[PDB]
Amino acid sequence: HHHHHIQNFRVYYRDSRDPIWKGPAKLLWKGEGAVVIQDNSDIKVVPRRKAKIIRD
Amino acid sequence: HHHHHIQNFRVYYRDSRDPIWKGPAKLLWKGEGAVVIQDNSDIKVVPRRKAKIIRD
Amino acid sequence: HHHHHIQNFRVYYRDSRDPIWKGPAKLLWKGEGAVVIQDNSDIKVVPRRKAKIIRD
Ligand code: NI
């Protein structure tokens, strides 16, 4: 069981109540108001406002 | 590998063809017509009509 | 931890840059422009244009 990340996509994300950006994370899904990322072994939901998707 | 749940959100869900509600479950994703929940070690997709999302 | 597939749904999917169809895969989620499938132990995101969802 493994969640293959969207190729050529890295995300920097801001956890609630912390201005420091974390990453780079892998993008697993992109919704209307949030995105799913995998930071190493942690998969989290991040509102788009707290995400910086970066193409490659 | 772990799916971190949406904080301050618990869901009660109705499996197809069973009126009894199950839960409380953790909310992992919220779409237009369905929601993703994690009931212990089981992650399932539940139509919004069969879900009771409860904020905290 | 397990991702229960949408019942009565099998998907055939085309990986980017390969015309050969793979499957059958299990449907885990259905979005606006893409779908989430599980091909054995691999969970991938597939644009709807590269997916053949088949009801049962
Ligand atoms: Ni998983």
Side-chain angles (χ1 to χ4, degrees), chain A residues 29-30, chain C residues 11-14 21 27 29-37 45-53 55:
Chain A
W29 183 259
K30 42 182 171 58
Chain C
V11 186
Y12 288 94
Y13 64 102
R14 189 177 59 183
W21 290 98
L27 181 66
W29 183 259
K30 42 182 171 58
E32 296 293 350
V35 294
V36 183
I37 61 84
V45 178
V46 174
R48 194 97 72 82
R49 290 152 47 260
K50 303 206 190 309
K52 299 178 71 63
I53 64 187
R55 295 176 182 268

Side-chain angles (χ1 to χ4, degrees), chain A:
Chain A
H1 165 86
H2 176 254
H3 289 251
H4 284 81
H5 59 92
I6 301 181
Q7 278 290 339
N8 309 321
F9 264 103
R10 261 70 199 176
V11 186
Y12 288 94
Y13 64 102
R14 189 177 59 183
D15 300 78
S16 180
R17 310 307 80 199
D18 195 78
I20 298 173
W21 290 98
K22 190 71 191 306
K26 308 219 180 188
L27 181 66
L28 300 188
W29 183 259
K30 42 182 171 58
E32 296 293 350
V35 294
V36 183
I37 61 84
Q38 176 161 6
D39 189 283
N40 195 281
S41 77
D42 300 326
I43 300 186
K44 314 174 188 173
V45 178
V46 174
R48 194 97 72 82
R49 290 152 47 260
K50 303 206 190 309
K52 299 178 71 63
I53 64 187
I54 293 160
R55 295 176 182 268
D56 296 319

Side-chain angles (χ1 to χ4, degrees), chain A residues 1 3 43, chain B residues 1 3 43, chain C residues 1 3 43:
Chain A
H1 165 86
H3 289 251
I43 300 186
Chain B
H1 165 86
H3 289 251
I43 300 186
Chain C
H1 165 86
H3 289 251
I43 300 186

